[PDB]
Design a binder for these strands. Sequence first.
DNA 1: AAAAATCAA
Length: 219
Amino acid sequence: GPSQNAIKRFMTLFSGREDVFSIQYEGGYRPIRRPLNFQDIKNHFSGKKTLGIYLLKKNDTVKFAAYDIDIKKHYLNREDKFVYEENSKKVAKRLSRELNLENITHYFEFTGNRGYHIWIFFDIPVSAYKIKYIMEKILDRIELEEGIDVEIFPKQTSLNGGLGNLIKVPLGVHKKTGKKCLFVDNDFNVIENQIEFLNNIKENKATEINKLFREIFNE
DNA sequence: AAAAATCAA
Ligand SMILES: Nc1nc2c(ncn2[C@@H]2O[C@H](COP(=O)(O)OP(=O)(O)OP(=O)(O)O)[C@@H](O)[C@H]2O)c(=O)[nH]1
Ligand SMILES: Nc1ncnc2c1ncn2[C@H]1C[C@H](O)[C@@H](COP(=O)(O)NP(=O)(O)OP(=O)(O)O)O1
Ligand SMILES: Nc1ncnc2c1ncn2[C@H]1C[C@H](O)[C@@H](COP(=O)(O)NP(=O)(O)OP(=O)(O)O)O1
Ligand SMILES: [Co+2]
Ligand SMILES: [Co+2]
Ligand SMILES: [Co+2]
Ligand SMILES: [Co+2]
């Protein structure tokens, strides 16, 4: 059924480090020293565990990348927090417009607490430094807003024998708040049929993205 | 049976 296809599809899209992943608890994350499995993903989808994925494979390539638009911590508790909610969507729309201009297919996710991820998926892994560079240059094009932080995963160009950074992946439960992390549309409205959205997500071409790095870098 | 908690920039 569609939900079973979603299990296999999730594993292909959020494919990072081969042999380590992460789970969220209340106050941190913890590495799990083995490959992610189907049972891990069923536990993600049901709320029994919350998965985070290390983006960098052992050869310092990534199969996906993400912007992380956040409300700054000290803006969170304000009574006019709705302003910085708007601002976070303003910054996300600007980034997305640039990404569309570069024909980079991407998807929005409400992260279950204080912001949004913009997910970028690749059919074949690409060098972590190349996508990171593209994402940094695109950020350098847009106006920012007060109280918003934009973060770029991958955070590393290379592991140097380490794990790198991980990102909490969608369709799970945010352990800081108990709310589902869900895909949203271009207007930030929650998609009703998440499973089907997941099964329609498209991968960018590594060949195109590789060409785009040389192009932006202008050699 | 449940409490405890990693790893990075
Ligand atoms: N790897 C790792 N990254 C972190 C950790 N804490 C924060 N970050 C990252 O740093 C960014 C800034 O978040 P902050 O809210 O300022 O994090 P903090 O200063 O440690 O305080 P809290 O997250 O509220 O506990 C986050 O979006 C995360 O990407 C951590 O303990 N380990
Ligand atoms: N203590 C920690 N240890 C290891 N990795 C962590 C971490 N904290 C975060 N990360 C990783 C996983 C995280 O996904 C990412 C930074 O995300 P955040 O901005 O802190 N939280 P998110 O974007 O997921 O949702 P929202 O912002 O609404 O709270 O770095
Ligand atoms: N004076 C005003 N006039 C019209 N709409 C207003 C408004 N004040 C607030 N709105 C609201 C009601 C409108 O339905 C909503 C639309 O604003 P976006 O969705 O941010 N931008 P757009 O839809 O034009 O396209 P894209 O997202 O691709 O950029 O703003
Ligand atoms: Co911290
Ligand atoms: Co962040
Ligand atoms: Co965030
Ligand atoms: Co709109």
